[PDB]
PDB file of C-alpha atoms and ligand atoms in Angstrom:
ATOM      1  CA  UNK S   1      -4.988  18.610  10.720  1.00 64.82           C
ATOM      2  CA  UNK S   2      -2.905  16.018   8.886  1.00 65.86           C
ATOM      3  CA  UNK S   3      -2.992  12.340   9.792  1.00 64.51           C
ATOM      4  CA  UNK S   4       0.610  11.178  10.410  1.00 64.63           C
ATOM      5  CA  UNK S   5       1.799   8.108   8.514  1.00 66.65           C
ATOM      6  CA  UNK S   6       4.972   6.168   7.810  1.00 67.54           C
ATOM      7  CA  UNK S   7       5.532   4.710   4.338  1.00 66.55           C
ATOM      8  CA  UNK S   8       7.368   1.405   3.732  1.00 64.77           C
ATOM      9  CA  UNK S   9       9.058   0.782   0.360  1.00 61.33           C
ATOM     10  CA  UNK S  10      11.439  -1.599  -1.394  1.00 60.98           C
ATOM     11  CA  UNK S  11      11.911   0.053  -4.771  1.00 60.69           C
ATOM     12  CA  UNK S  12      10.830   2.750  -7.153  1.00 59.40           C
ATOM     13  CA  UNK S  13       8.002   3.894  -4.870  1.00 57.68           C
ATOM     14  CA  UNK S  14       5.721   5.383  -7.527  1.00 58.16           C
ATOM     15  CA  UNK S  15       2.804   5.292  -5.083  1.00 61.42           C
ATOM     16  CA  UNK S  16       4.874   7.242  -2.563  1.00 62.87           C
ATOM     17  CA  UNK S  17       5.194   9.930  -5.242  1.00 59.55           C
ATOM     18  CA  UNK S  18       1.451   9.976  -5.785  1.00 63.61           C
ATOM     19  CA  UNK S  19       0.903  10.562  -2.069  1.00 62.06           C
ATOM     20  CA  UNK S  20       3.569  13.303  -2.016  1.00 61.93           C
ATOM     21  CA  UNK S  21       1.796  15.018  -4.902  1.00 59.35           C
ATOM     22  CA  UNK S  22      -1.645  14.692  -3.331  1.00 56.62           C
ATOM     23  CA  UNK S  23      -0.379  16.275  -0.107  1.00 57.19           C
ATOM     24  CA  UNK S  24       0.899  19.220  -2.141  1.00 56.69           C
ATOM     25  CA  UNK S  25      -2.645  19.532  -3.450  1.00 54.61           C
ATOM     26  CA  UNK S  26      -4.200  19.488   0.039  1.00 57.45           C
ATOM     27  CA  UNK S  27      -4.466  15.830   1.121  1.00 55.15           C
ATOM     28  CA  UNK S  28      -4.522  15.914   4.942  1.00 57.28           C
ATOM     29  CA  UNK S  29      -1.618  13.506   5.396  1.00 60.33           C
ATOM     30  CA  UNK S  30       1.827  14.018   6.895  1.00 60.46           C
ATOM     31  CA  UNK S  31       4.497  11.565   5.785  1.00 61.09           C
ATOM     32  CA  UNK S  32       6.686  11.484   8.882  1.00 61.30           C
ATOM     33  CA  UNK S  33       9.155   8.996   7.422  1.00 59.67           C
ATOM     34  CA  UNK S  34       9.913   6.648   4.554  1.00 60.30           C
ATOM     35  CA  UNK S  35      11.541   3.306   5.405  1.00 60.13           C
ATOM     36  CA  UNK S  36      13.152   1.013   2.828  1.00 57.49           C
ATOM     37  CA  UNK S  37      14.557  -2.505   3.286  1.00 57.18           C
ATOM     38  CA  UNK S  38      16.822  -1.882   0.291  1.00 56.92           C
ATOM     39  CA  UNK S  39      19.550   0.752   0.039  1.00 56.70           C
ATOM     40  CA  UNK S  40      19.093   0.992  -3.758  1.00 58.43           C
ATOM     41  CA  UNK S  41      15.381   1.889  -3.674  1.00 59.04           C
ATOM     42  CA  UNK S  42      14.754   4.928  -5.871  1.00 61.04           C
ATOM     43  CA  UNK S  43      11.845   5.744  -3.574  1.00 61.72           C
ATOM     44  CA  UNK S  44      14.471   6.858  -1.048  1.00 63.23           C
ATOM     45  CA  UNK S  45      15.431   9.620  -3.486  1.00 62.47           C
ATOM     46  CA  UNK S  46      11.757  10.591  -3.992  1.00 62.08           C
ATOM     47  CA  UNK S  47      11.386  11.018  -0.217  1.00 64.76           C
ATOM     48  CA  UNK S  48      14.660  12.921   0.224  1.00 62.60           C
ATOM     49  CA  UNK S  49      13.560  15.318  -2.514  1.00 61.47           C
ATOM     50  CA  UNK S  50      10.488  16.060  -0.353  1.00 60.21           C
ATOM     51  CA  UNK S  51      12.571  16.554   2.822  1.00 64.92           C
ATOM     52  CA  UNK S  52      11.164  13.389   4.417  1.00 64.29           C
ATOM     53  CA  UNK S  53      13.512  11.478   6.761  1.00 64.58           C
ATOM     54  CA  UNK S  54      14.549   8.144   5.228  1.00 68.08           C
ATOM     55  CA  UNK S  55      15.623   4.957   6.982  1.00 69.70           C
ATOM     56  CA  UNK S  56      17.390   2.023   5.369  1.00 67.95           C
ATOM     57  CA  UNK S  57      16.777  -1.274   7.170  1.00 67.36           C
ATOM     58  CA  UNK S  58      18.466  -4.018   5.103  1.00 65.93           C
ATOM     59  CA  UNK S  59      16.736  -7.254   6.059  1.00 65.08           C
ATOM     60  CA  UNK S  60      19.764  -9.472   5.322  1.00 63.56           C
ATOM     61  CA  UNK S  61      21.857  -7.607   7.903  1.00 65.95           C
ATOM     62  CA  UNK S  62      19.881  -9.151  10.748  1.00 64.35           C
ATOM     63  CA  UNK S  63      20.404 -12.569  12.420  1.00 63.51           C
ATOM     64  CA  UNK S  64      16.717 -13.398  11.909  1.00 68.43           C
ATOM     65  CA  UNK S  65      13.402 -12.166  10.511  1.00 68.81           C
ATOM     66  CA  UNK S  66      12.283 -11.134  14.017  1.00 68.05           C
ATOM     67  CA  UNK S  67      15.370  -9.004  14.649  1.00 69.45           C
ATOM     68  CA  UNK S  68      14.768  -7.226  11.345  1.00 69.69           C
ATOM     69  CA  UNK S  69      11.110  -6.839  12.239  1.00 70.57           C
ATOM     70  CA  UNK S  70      12.008  -5.554  15.694  1.00 73.28           C
ATOM     71  CA  UNK S  71      14.175  -2.763  14.257  1.00 72.58           C
ATOM     72  CA  UNK S  72      11.493  -2.016  11.644  1.00 72.01           C
ATOM     73  CA  UNK S  73       8.772  -1.719  14.302  1.00 70.65           C
ATOM     74  CA  UNK S  74      10.902   0.446  16.600  1.00 67.15           C
ATOM     75  CA  UNK S  75      11.825   2.738  13.701  1.00 66.13           C
ATOM     76  CA  UNK S  76       8.196   3.017  12.656  1.00 68.54           C
ATOM     77  CA  UNK S  77       6.962   3.600  16.205  1.00 68.81           C
ATOM     78  CA  UNK S  78       9.478   6.390  16.833  1.00 68.76           C
ATOM     79  CA  UNK S  79       7.249   8.570  14.635  1.00 64.76           C
ATOM     80  CA  UNK S  80       3.976   7.688  16.369  1.00 64.02           C
ATOM     81  CA  UNK S  81       2.155   7.231  13.053  1.00 66.66           C
ATOM     82  CA  UNK S  82      -1.594   6.587  12.955  1.00 64.14           C
ATOM     83  CA  UNK S  83      -1.236   4.581   9.752  1.00 69.21           C
ATOM     84  CA  UNK S  84       1.461   2.406   8.164  1.00 70.62           C
ATOM     85  CA  UNK S  85       1.299   2.551   4.365  1.00 71.88           C
ATOM     86  CA  UNK S  86       3.004   0.040   2.109  1.00 72.48           C
ATOM     87  CA  UNK S  87       4.108   1.257  -1.309  1.00 71.15           C
ATOM     88  CA  UNK S  88       5.910  -1.488  -3.188  1.00 74.31           C
ATOM     89  CA  UNK S  89       7.214  -3.016   0.077  1.00 73.84           C
ATOM     90  CA  UNK S  90       8.211  -6.554  -0.933  1.00 75.42           C
ATOM     91  CA  UNK S  91       9.191  -8.367   2.293  1.00 75.69           C
ATOM     92  CA  UNK S  92       6.678 -10.718   3.865  1.00 75.23           C
ATOM     93  CA  UNK S  93       5.878  -9.708   7.433  1.00 76.49           C
ATOM     94  CA  UNK S  94       5.472 -12.126  10.341  1.00 77.00           C
ATOM     95  CA  UNK S  95       2.325 -12.765  12.378  1.00 78.07           C
ATOM     96  CA  UNK S  96       3.507 -10.733  15.371  1.00 79.12           C
ATOM     97  CA  UNK S  97       4.410  -7.694  13.296  1.00 78.23           C
ATOM     98  CA  UNK S  98       1.065  -7.734  11.469  1.00 78.91           C
ATOM     99  CA  UNK S  99      -0.746  -7.948  14.845  1.00 77.19           C
ATOM    100  CA  UNK S 100       1.170  -5.015  16.278  1.00 76.74           C
ATOM    101  CA  UNK S 101      -0.267  -2.899  13.449  1.00 73.76           C
ATOM    102  CA  UNK S 102      -3.754  -4.401  13.107  1.00 72.67           C
ATOM    103  CA  UNK S 103      -6.319  -1.923  11.787  1.00 74.50           C
ATOM    104  CA  UNK S 104      -3.484   0.547  11.134  1.00 78.42           C
ATOM    105  CA  UNK S 105      -1.579  -0.940   8.198  1.00 77.86           C
ATOM    106  CA  UNK S 106      -2.570  -1.015   4.531  1.00 78.83           C
ATOM    107  CA  UNK S 107      -1.297  -2.016   1.099  1.00 80.07           C
ATOM    108  CA  UNK S 108      -2.171  -1.408  -2.555  1.00 80.62           C
ATOM    109  CA  UNK S 109      -2.037  -4.244  -5.087  1.00 80.11           C
ATOM    110  CA  UNK S 110      -2.357  -4.046  -8.900  1.00 78.71           C
ATOM    111  CA  UNK S 111      -5.089  -6.679  -9.337  1.00 78.08           C
ATOM    112  CA  UNK S 112      -8.727  -7.344  -8.513  1.00 77.07           C
ATOM    113  CA  UNK S 113      -8.033  -9.333  -5.331  1.00 74.69           C
ATOM    114  CA  UNK S 114      -8.392 -12.145  -4.446  1.00 74.63           C
ATOM    115  CA  UNK S 115      -7.212 -12.910  -8.013  1.00 73.47           C
ATOM    116  CA  UNK S 116      -3.544 -12.536  -8.997  1.00 75.16           C
ATOM    117  CA  UNK S 117      -1.717 -12.148  -5.705  1.00 72.59           C
ATOM    118  CA  UNK S 118       2.013 -11.890  -6.332  1.00 75.01           C
ATOM    119  CA  UNK S 119       3.843 -10.502  -9.355  1.00 73.48           C
ATOM    120  CA  UNK S 120       3.205  -9.891 -13.067  1.00 73.82           C
ATOM    121  CA  UNK S 121      -0.522  -9.334 -12.493  1.00 73.66           C
ATOM    122  CA  UNK S 122      -1.177  -7.593 -15.803  1.00 72.68           C
ATOM    123  CA  UNK S 123       0.322 -10.336 -17.925  1.00 72.23           C
ATOM    124  CA  UNK S 124      -1.449 -13.000 -15.886  1.00 70.45           C
ATOM    125  CA  UNK S 125      -4.873 -11.293 -16.225  1.00 69.07           C
ATOM    126  CA  UNK S 126      -4.296 -11.053 -19.964  1.00 69.76           C
ATOM    127  CA  UNK S 127      -3.103 -14.668 -20.224  1.00 68.17           C
ATOM    128  CA  UNK S 128      -6.244 -15.883 -18.436  1.00 67.19           C
ATOM    129  CA  UNK S 129      -8.453 -13.914 -20.820  1.00 67.60           C
ATOM    130  CA  UNK S 130      -9.887 -11.614 -18.132  1.00 69.19           C
ATOM    131  CA  UNK S 131     -12.135  -8.826 -19.458  1.00 70.26           C
ATOM    132  CA  UNK S 132     -11.639  -6.696 -16.350  1.00 68.80           C
ATOM    133  CA  UNK S 133      -8.615  -5.823 -14.236  1.00 68.67           C
ATOM    134  CA  UNK S 134      -7.606  -3.105 -11.791  1.00 67.62           C
ATOM    135  CA  UNK S 135      -6.263  -2.337  -8.344  1.00 67.76           C
ATOM    136  CA  UNK S 136      -7.190  -3.127  -4.726  1.00 67.44           C
ATOM    137  CA  UNK S 137      -6.390  -1.347  -1.453  1.00 65.20           C
ATOM    138  CA  UNK S 138      -6.599  -3.552   1.630  1.00 65.65           C
ATOM    139  CA  UNK S 139      -5.607  -4.021   5.267  1.00 68.70           C
ATOM    140  CA  UNK S 140      -2.495  -6.147   5.712  1.00 69.05           C
ATOM    141  CA  UNK S 141      -2.952  -9.624   7.232  1.00 72.47           C
ATOM    142  CA  UNK S 142      -1.124 -13.945   3.669  1.00 72.25           C
ATOM    143  CA  UNK S 143       0.454 -12.721   0.409  1.00 73.29           C
ATOM    144  CA  UNK S 144      -1.406  -9.661  -0.899  1.00 70.69           C
ATOM    145  CA  UNK S 145      -4.522 -10.492   1.154  1.00 68.78           C
ATOM    146  CA  UNK S 146      -6.826  -8.880   3.694  1.00 71.04           C
ATOM    147  CA  UNK S 147     -10.169  -7.102   4.155  1.00 70.63           C
ATOM    148  CA  UNK S 148     -10.679  -4.859   1.106  1.00 68.78           C
ATOM    149  CA  UNK S 149     -11.126  -1.081   1.440  1.00 70.62           C
ATOM    150  CA  UNK S 150     -11.385  -0.044  -2.215  1.00 71.06           C
ATOM    151  CA  UNK S 151     -11.207  -1.674  -5.628  1.00 72.03           C
ATOM    152  CA  UNK S 152     -11.050   0.208  -8.914  1.00 70.96           C
ATOM    153  CA  UNK S 153     -11.570  -1.646 -12.170  1.00 70.90           C
ATOM    154  CA  UNK S 154     -11.144  -1.062 -15.888  1.00 73.02           C
ATOM    155  CA  UNK S 155     -11.740  -2.992 -19.106  1.00 69.44           C
ATOM    156  CA  UNK S 156      -9.238  -5.104 -20.982  1.00 66.18           C
ATOM    157  CA  UNK S 157      -9.780  -4.558 -24.722  1.00 64.43           C
ATOM    158  CA  UNK S 158      -8.279  -6.322 -27.771  1.00 63.65           C
ATOM    159  CA  UNK S 159      -5.417  -3.824 -28.230  1.00 65.35           C
ATOM    160  CA  UNK S 160      -4.293  -3.969 -24.574  1.00 62.44           C
ATOM    161  CA  UNK S 161      -0.908  -5.489 -23.812  1.00 61.96           C
ATOM    162  CA  UNK S 162       0.740  -6.104 -20.445  1.00 61.43           C
ATOM    163  CA  UNK S 163       2.371  -2.670 -20.788  1.00 58.09           C
ATOM    164  CA  UNK S 164      -0.843  -0.745 -21.525  1.00 53.98           C
ATOM    165  CA  UNK S 165      -2.533  -2.448 -18.584  1.00 56.82           C
ATOM    166  CA  UNK S 166       0.340  -1.729 -16.213  1.00 56.07           C
ATOM    167  CA  UNK S 167       0.234   1.952 -17.192  1.00 56.95           C
ATOM    168  CA  UNK S 168      -3.587   2.264 -17.071  1.00 55.00           C
ATOM    169  CA  UNK S 169      -3.688   0.492 -13.702  1.00 54.80           C
ATOM    170  CA  UNK S 170      -0.871   2.743 -12.512  1.00 51.39           C
ATOM    171  CA  UNK S 171      -3.246   5.684 -13.145  1.00 50.46           C
ATOM    172  CA  UNK S 172      -5.868   3.966 -10.966  1.00 49.03           C
ATOM    173  CA  UNK S 173      -3.279   3.428  -8.214  1.00 49.58           C
ATOM    174  CA  UNK S 174      -2.389   7.123  -8.242  1.00 52.22           C
ATOM    175  CA  UNK S 175      -6.062   7.998  -7.925  1.00 52.70           C
ATOM    176  CA  UNK S 176      -7.280   5.552  -5.326  1.00 55.53           C
ATOM    177  CA  UNK S 177      -4.390   5.307  -2.814  1.00 54.01           C
ATOM    178  CA  UNK S 178      -4.466   9.033  -1.943  1.00 54.64           C
ATOM    179  CA  UNK S 179      -8.271   8.840  -1.888  1.00 53.99           C
ATOM    180  CA  UNK S 180      -8.225   6.003   0.648  1.00 54.14           C
ATOM    181  CA  UNK S 181      -5.669   7.961   2.684  1.00 52.91           C
ATOM    182  CA  UNK S 182      -8.174  10.855   2.659  1.00 54.80           C
ATOM    183  CA  UNK S 183     -10.838   8.550   4.146  1.00 54.61           C
ATOM    184  CA  UNK S 184      -8.531   7.650   7.020  1.00 52.35           C
ATOM    185  CA  UNK S 185      -7.558  11.293   7.574  1.00 51.13           C
ATOM    186  CA  UNK S 186     -11.273  12.176   7.851  1.00 51.79           C
ATOM    187  CA  UNK S 187     -11.916   9.348  10.315  1.00 50.85           C
ATOM    188  CA  UNK S 188     -14.272   7.517   7.948  1.00 48.69           C
ATOM    189  CA  UNK S 189     -12.863   3.984   8.176  1.00 52.24           C
ATOM    190  CA  UNK S 190     -13.000   1.175  10.717  1.00 54.64           C
ATOM    191  CA  UNK S 191     -11.896  -2.412  10.752  1.00 54.09           C
ATOM    192  CA  UNK S 192     -13.999  -4.642  12.985  1.00 51.83           C
ATOM    193  CA  UNK S 193     -14.722  -8.378  13.138  1.00 54.00           C
ATOM    194  CA  UNK S 194     -13.286  -9.222   9.713  1.00 55.73           C
ATOM    195  CA  UNK S 195     -15.245  -6.365   8.167  1.00 59.86           C
ATOM    196  CA  UNK S 196     -14.452  -2.891   6.837  1.00 59.16           C
ATOM    197  CA  UNK S 197     -16.795   0.010   7.614  1.00 62.75           C
ATOM    198  CA  UNK S 198     -17.015   3.343   5.776  1.00 60.08           C
ATOM    199  CA  UNK S 199     -18.941   6.088   7.590  1.00 61.96           C
ATOM    200  CA  UNK S 200     -20.187   3.417  10.018  1.00 61.67           C
ATOM    201  CA  UNK S 201     -21.636   1.169   7.276  1.00 64.00           C
ATOM    202  CA  UNK S 202     -20.306  -2.244   6.229  1.00 60.06           C
ATOM    203  CA  UNK S 203     -18.616  -2.264   2.831  1.00 62.10           C
ATOM    204  CA  UNK S 204     -19.082  -5.137   0.412  1.00 60.04           C
ATOM    205  CA  UNK S 205     -16.375  -7.806   0.662  1.00 61.08           C
ATOM    206  CA  UNK S 206     -14.835  -6.317  -2.484  1.00 61.52           C
ATOM    207  CA  UNK S 207     -14.574  -2.902  -0.774  1.00 64.65           C
ATOM    208  CA  UNK S 208     -15.880   0.381  -2.152  1.00 64.92           C
ATOM    209  CA  UNK S 209     -16.059   0.058  -5.942  1.00 63.62           C
ATOM    210  CA  UNK S 210     -14.962   2.397  -8.727  1.00 64.91           C
ATOM    211  CA  UNK S 211     -16.473   3.070 -11.161  1.00 65.35           C
TER     212      UNK S 211
HETATM  213 CL1  LIG H   1     -14.383   2.610 -16.907  1.00 65.08          CL
END
């Protein structure tokens, strides 16, 4: 029986597409709604194509961050999701909002956290001369930070450019996000006392590693 989620987006929503595809292939997830803070997010079209209700909640149209967040939370909660899943959602969320969803809200980030929070991760890893790079899935707490669930890594080689890395890491995103969602659907994950547990066992701080 599918675990109900709500997905938050700001843009293209490529990870939303990956989840949509995985569901078609049997992933036990129901996307009850997709919510965007931008009317021009292509991800809205991805959702509509899959007959998923979409909500636009333009953050600038609210007197304050808390009003915006209030409408966001009420819109989310209407669907009684078990999990809130960020997919390219770019607004920072306040302390209260993050608390309301503690243990129930996750994000995917195209770096090996805690390195390279923020934008342009691939170019920054290259510029620093990293030999490894990848993607992290974590609970939301601080910019792109929180207890790690899963981290997938790959090698940077001499012919890599920021574009090859972005594309190769995009493949890892499409693999690991739906996989983590499958862990939640199967009741395998817990967040307790600053630690993540998988099948009742503490994960390493870096989360479950691939390869
Ligand atoms: Cl590898």
